[PDB]
Nucleic acid binder design. Structure first.
Ligand SMILES: Nc1ncnc2c1ncn2[C@@H]1O[C@H](COP(=O)(O)OP(=O)(O)O)[C@@H](O)[C@H]1O
Lengths: 580, 97, 99, 109, 88, 111, 98, 100, 83
DNA sequence: ATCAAAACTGTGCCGCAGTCGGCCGACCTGAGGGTCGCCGGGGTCTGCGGGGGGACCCTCTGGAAAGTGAAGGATAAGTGACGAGCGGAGACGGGATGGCGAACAGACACAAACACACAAGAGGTGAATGTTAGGACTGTTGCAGAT
DNA sequence: ATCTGCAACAGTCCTAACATTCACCTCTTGTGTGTTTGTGTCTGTTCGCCATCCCGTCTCCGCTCGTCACTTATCCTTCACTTTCCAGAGGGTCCCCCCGCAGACCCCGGCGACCCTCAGGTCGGCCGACTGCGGCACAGTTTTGAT
């Protein structure tokens, strides 16, 4: 019950930023609110929740604290930030200088939204070519600047520029790169000479980590270093199923909620705009194939039980074998593509079942990958079958990335499926027209969730997003799946924290946290391959049932080489017995 | 008076010669060449074994140090068959009595 | 009108600046990829330290510098200026690294 | 009884080189602090291999010269014509040894 | 198709043509042929093979997987080419 | 058991005579390490370090710096002739060469 | 609290002799490492030569005279002359003056 | 008649054949011995010499000079010649490392 | 005769016989004097090291093992004159 | 295409040098046992390298073109190599004074290993705390080249 | 051959990595004190070998004359490397996300030094006697160079 103790500590060390220049008793010690939006916020108006967040951030400036906006994707973060800046211009009259840091994939949109919502403010961009930047350097040493856009790399590359300026208020963006404490940008921001205030701005809280340490317990508020650098482990030790996690450390969870009420703010998309219809998170499961079978453990039995850190190598055989391409020549030395040689991975039989029949229904399909050699092999097959697709990677140099949205989003675009990488794009796909997502392998993070789901969950789609997820029988990819998903449902606590991080009907963290504990109790209650079943759970309605059964009746008069190649026979037991 | 003994590898060189060619004789000058050759390769291999001893912070020359010194000093095919003869001799020495 | 040097003067100013400086002249990441390739030709599991890659880079760059000096001596002695493969083979035979 | 003192260490491994003499030299030559047990056996096997190889290659070369006795000329031809032995003994000159019959090709008309 | 590592540039070619040319300019060479580049890549390949073979022999003796600074310094010390700086 | 001068301070040296004695004594260079042996060898090592640092300090002054770098040791070692003969196998790291071009490669006086 | 295990170099002694021969000169760290390897290299050469002479005379003791002969064999010319002079001076001072 | 004066070069080739067949010493023993006793007289006065020591020096220095003339012939074929010259010996001792 | 012709006792045809063993087909006129200089420097080095060992053992006879140890530390090993 | 020197074979038989019982001398490996130092080992804390990928910023390489200085071949005068002959001279295999220093044989002292306690020199670590080398701005001119 | 060109070379804040010095914390570890062998030291005797002579011998260096095929210097042609320029792209940083591995400390049994006797393997000088080899003669083959 260290809540009163840390509130006495914030009662002590609140006036650090004041003099130098209950948990409500720091964030609600002053009561001054302005609800009407400022004057020069031209080009539209706010919603109600944007006004409420504006009110909270004015309260943050009045409380002289370093706050965090952490609301959801598609809720106007940039416009709330520029509303804060034009309030601090107009009413607070300090009128500068305002550092902002955004990613390079967003700075065009940020400088564009400066033109709509605040034309009177003086804004400076930063880009390549120091030949261009030398004039802006001499301009910004002169003092005529309020809003200074920049990006991550120009912080360290303009260390001298930012050293020779005394700021007032910075507001940075994209917190999931700030999520590392010993990062180079985080170390330069520690040795930055922080002026007064800073705000992270993330659509995503804690993801594949311990709780919200990196920023919200060390970086953003500098008292929380000297208070909770030791109790990080003591309040992360909840995570041993009934007595620890549910009986006694429910109070530890509630103390985390109580200490993460005043500093944060989080609103939900279904609660205000709700323009997204739905999401249908379905999963299936594949099985092993020829080299992936019981033969594969002999490969580990004579390499290890040899390629280093085999967990990276074990994922290659469950995505698709002969990415090595040394054993491809042991099956197909002529390197000519044909049936049941590409199709010797178990997910790929499911592909040439499902993909021609969603082609029979006409859904626009986002196909995700890690490990871009799998993307190359999928390219080779998807030219072997000749059905239309497009590719995006990390090598597209952003020009064809910005261009390719029109090539995919033509109103009669006969490109239906669409290859992607999960990491790729950097929240810059900005797509809405596709309506089915299938996924080969799963990341270590739920940022695959809160990005690649949101590539169709954003504004502009009215279909029913049917998500599928692939996994084989008894692979290591299963323990990636269960490990990441169920031991990183810790973000469920923060997505429940948001609903009282908002206007806070105070029954939330008891009653609807128990409704969250419905999920926390059917975690392991859910513990302990069909054509018609998968064909139903891909479909939507009865005229898709009609065309799938019509495909069934068309291949009923026909029979449908076999379904999956096996360990042919002696080549598999001769493959990896001569290597090592 | 009785002269102090000069000890060398003469009869051992001559014995290997009578294994590999039963009719050939060796000279005296060539016997001294083979003697100095054996002293030379012994000084090389035991010097390298002692360098491996002092590098690995260890105080005991073992068969592993003699094998690593052989792999370093002798090249190529000679290194391979020398390690072969060594493993054969040490396993026959430990095994049989 | 274009101020083109007569051929040779760029070579002489390069010779003076690279004898005056002392950095490493081969790019670190392709040299490291070469070293890890050649180590993969022996024992397929290995690992290095950054000081070991810089050790091999110091050794190979100082070796090639000494070899190119002796190649320049052999190519001067053949009444030439252009060094050639027979000059490199002569330096590495008279030195005795080949035969 | 006095137990049957026999079976020298050269007899057990099947070596001709004196393993006791090699072990005495490895001890009192101040190489390391304490010589092992397999060490002189391994080392005498290596030296027996090298002497067997060189006397093999010289006895091939005394046959070629029609003479039933190995001379330093024969040891020179054997060592400097085997490539690996040349690269092993490349620093070493052999007394009364001569050189090889090797004329440069571009000298003869 | 385009999936192969056969359609990719091999790794000895990363010792680039101006890098060899710069080594020769430090060496004093005023004018270089066009075949010096290929011959020097062969010479560098053989030299690194010898040094790395001796360093991996030291490493596999010491029952470890990590080639270190001292292992390469010892391989260079018995190579002849003694190196200073990187270890006692 | 009075106060104890170190053996280096007795011998009038700077290099640690006891440390050179134990390095000889544990390196297995002989059975018996003498008494004059670490004193004599520490004096030789002090002389060689004195000569190297003397010449490197002169070349450090001549490039107008006050700090001795590997380039400075490379110039001192390869510009003393007896040190060129002694250290003639050694590669000094970050060394560089002596700046020295042949007289055939230099241009003519006629143009 | 791990107490990084001591590796004992000649760094402070090189620095002390440097502050004798040049009263106001500093030394870079990689140059200190080079002089460290230099002192270990010359020590191992001279001790190895005294080892070979202890074997060759059929004796078992490294003394002042075996180090003197190792100096005269490894060091060239003027260096060897002055190093033998320095050594004889230091040993007679150590033996005579206590 | 005409006395058969050989074409110049063929006598050099038959000498190359007979001195690569034979194996004796080529510098005569007493002149080489007086040389060695001079060069030892540079250092110490009352020295003495086993015949094995003098013949050891003779085997060593003749092997050194035969190796030097082999590498000198390589350099003087490299300069598109046959005649060896003093620049060839100085070049061979410069590449090998004995001079500079 | 009078220590004039010591190195001159390395005769012109003996230098020619060494050069014929080396493979040389045709010889200049200054090869002779340069080879005399080369031989003298090499023997100065070897006899300096052999006299250093002989002084060290407190004896007055430069022997074959002293020459072999001098040549061995020179870098040129000598087989056949002592174990 | 035929005569001409000459070097490799073939023969004889002789000087010496390996070689082989041998015989016996002597010293130094073998083993069977006592005992303690070394190293493999199985376990925790800690920091760095691996292995698939992303994002972004630039200098550095790369392809190509115009040009011109070096390489190299064809010729031709120059001459310093080689070859043969022949008259002395120093090297060489033989053999013997003569003396000297190198190699063994013995007693005995100092000199060095070993063990023991300690405190004082030496190694890590912040930590200011400078502070002195790189990173550019103006500015000057020393060396190379188009008219 | 003056003028333009241009790139290396100096002044001058500036910031920051990086020596540098307290400082004091262990904390190793070199030093003082004390037996204990034992390895070197001096003497002292002999003999194997090295220097020093002659000494005939004889073949090999040294000179000298002829002669010519090689070195070297012109001169021409040809082409291949150099320098500049524009564009793109891979090195250089950073970041992701997890694992695994070397290094650094603790008990503990495996084994190699340690004496101590024992016998027989190796060595060395003669002695036997044995065949491999040269050393100055004495025939038949195969390269070289002019008609
Ligand atoms: N009050 C508003 N009125 C009109 N458009 C808005 C408003 N708030 C947000 N938007 C839209 O949201 C987009 C940017 O939202 P953003 O700040 O990126 O929020 P998120 O990060 O949650 O997507 C803009 O294109 C803008 O058109």
């Amino acid at each position: 019950l260290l809540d009163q103790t840390k509130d006495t500590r914030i009662t002590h060390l609140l006036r650090q930023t004041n003099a130098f220049l209950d948990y409500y008793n720091v964030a609600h010690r002053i009561k001054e609110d302005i609800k009407k939006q400022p004057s020069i916020l031209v080009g539209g108006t706010l919603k109600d929740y944007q006004i409420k967040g504006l009110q909270w951030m004015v309260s943050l400036f009045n409380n002289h604290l370093n706050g965090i906006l952490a609301d959801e994707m598609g809720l106007g973060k940039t416009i709330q930030t520029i509303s804060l800046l034009t309030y601090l211009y107009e009413m607070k009259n300090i009128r500068g200088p305002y550092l902002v840091i955004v990613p390079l994939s967003t700075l065009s949109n940020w400088s564009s939204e400066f033109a709509k919502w605040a034309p009177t403010l003086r804004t400076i961009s930063f880009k390549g070519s120091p030949n261009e930047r030398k004039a802006k350097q001499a301009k910004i040493r002169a003092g005529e600047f309020d809003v200074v856009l920049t990006t991550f790399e120009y912080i360290i590359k303009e260390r001298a520029l930012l050293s020779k300026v005394k700021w007032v208020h910075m507001i940075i963006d994209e917190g999931h790169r700030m999520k590392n404490a010993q990062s180079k940008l985080s170390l330069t921001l520690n040795t930055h000479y922080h002026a007064d205030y800073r705000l992270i701005l993330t659509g995503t809280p804690l993801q594949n980590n311990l709780p919200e340490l990196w920023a919200l317990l060390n970086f953003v508020l500098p008292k929380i270093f000297n208070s909770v650098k030791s109790f990080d482990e003591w309040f992360n030790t909840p995570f041993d199923k009934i007595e620890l996690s549910e009986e006694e450390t429910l109070l530890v969870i509630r103390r985390l909620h109580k200490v993460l009420r005043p500093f944060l703010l989080r609103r939900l998309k279904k609660d205000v705009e709700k323009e997204l219809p739905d999401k249908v998170e379905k999963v299936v499961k594949c099985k092993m194939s020829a080299l992936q079978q019981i033969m594969y453990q002999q490969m580990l039995k004579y390499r290890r039980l040899g390629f280093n850190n085999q967990i990276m190598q074990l994922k290659k055989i469950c995505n698709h074998p002969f990415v090595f391409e040394e054993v491809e020549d042991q099956i197909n030395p002529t390197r000519e593509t044909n049936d049941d040689i590409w199709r010797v991975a178990g997910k790929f039989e499911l592909l040439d079942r499902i993909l021609p029949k969603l082609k029979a229904t006409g859904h626009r399909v986002l196909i995700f990958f890690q490990m871009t050699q799998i993307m190359d092999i999928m390219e080779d097959f998807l030219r072997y079958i000749n059905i239309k697709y497009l590719r995006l990677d990390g090598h597209t140099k952003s020009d064809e990335r910005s261009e390719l949205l029109r090539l995919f989003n033509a109103p009669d675009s006969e490109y239906l499926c669409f290859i992607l990488s999960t990491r790729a794009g950097g929240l810059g796909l900005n797509l809405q027209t596709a309506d089915t997502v299938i996924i080969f392998d799963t990341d270590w993070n739920p940022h695959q969730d809160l990005q690649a789901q949101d590539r169709a969950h954003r504004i502009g789609q009215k279909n029913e997003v049917r998500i599928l997820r692939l996994i084989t029988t008894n692979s290591v990819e299963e323990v990636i799946l269960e490990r990441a998903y169920k031991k990183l449902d810790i973000d469920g606590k923060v997505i429940q924290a948001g609903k009282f991080d908002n206007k806070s009907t105070s029954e939330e963290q008891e009653a609807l946290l128990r409704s969250l504990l419905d999920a926390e109790e059917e975690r392991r209650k859910k513990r302990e391959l069909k054509d018609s079943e998968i064909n139903e759970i891909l479909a939507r309605n009865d005229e898709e049932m009609a065309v799938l059964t019509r495909m069934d009746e068309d291949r009923s008069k026909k029979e449908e080489k076999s379904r999956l190649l096996e360990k042919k026979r002696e080549e598999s037991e001769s493959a990896a017995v001569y290597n090592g | 008076r009785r002269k102090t003994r000069k000890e060398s590898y003469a009869i051992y060189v001559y014995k290997v010669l009578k294994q590999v060619h039963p009719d050939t004789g060796i000279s005296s000058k060539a016997m001294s060449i083979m003697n100095s050759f054996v002293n030379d390769v012994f000084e090389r291999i035991a010097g390298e074994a002692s360098r491996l001893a002092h590098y690995n912070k260890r105080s005991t020359i073992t068969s592993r140090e003699i094998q690593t010194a052989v792999r370093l000093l002798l090249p190529g095919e000679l290194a391979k068959h020398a390690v072969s003869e060594g493993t054969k001799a040490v396993t026959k020495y430990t095994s049989a009595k | 009108k274009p101020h083109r040097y007569r051929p040779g003067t760029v070579a002489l100013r390069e010779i003076r600046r690279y004898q005056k400086s002392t950095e490493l002249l081969i790019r670190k990441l392709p040299f490291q990829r070469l070293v890890r390739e050649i180590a993969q030709d022996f024992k397929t599991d290995l690992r290095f330290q950054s000081s070991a890659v810089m050790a091999l880079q110091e050794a190979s760059e100082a070796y090639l510098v000494a070899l190119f000096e002796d190649t320049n001596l052999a190519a001067i002695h053949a009444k030439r200026v252009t060094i050639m493969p027979k000059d490199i083979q002569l330096a590495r035979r008279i030195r005795g690294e080949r035969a | 009884k006095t137990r049957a003192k026999a079976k020298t260490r050269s007899s057990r491994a099947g070596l001709q080189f004196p393993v006791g003499r090699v072990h005495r030299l490895l001890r009192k030559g101040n190489y390391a602090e304490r010589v092992g047990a397999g060490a002189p056996v391994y080392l005498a096997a290596v030296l027996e291999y090298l002497t067997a190889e060189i006397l093999e290659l010289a006895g091939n070369a005394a046959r070629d010269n029609k003479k039933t006795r190995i001379i330093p000329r024969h040891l020179q031809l054997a060592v400097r014509n085997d490539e690996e032995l040349n690269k092993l003994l490349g620093r070493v000159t052999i007394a009364q040894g001569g050189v090889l019959p090797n004329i440069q090709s571009v000298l003869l008309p | 198709a385009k999936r192969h590592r056969k359609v990719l540039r091999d790794n000895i070619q990363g010792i680039t043509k101006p890098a060899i040319r710069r080594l020769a300019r430090r060496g004093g060479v005023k004018r270089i042929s066009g075949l010096i580049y290929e011959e020097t890549r062969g010479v560098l390949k053989v030299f690194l093979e010898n040094v790395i073979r001796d360093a991996v022999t030291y490493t596999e003796h010491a029952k470890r997987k990590t080639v270190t600074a001292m292992d390469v310094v010892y391989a260079l010390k018995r190579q002849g080419r003694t190196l200073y700086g990187f270890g006692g």
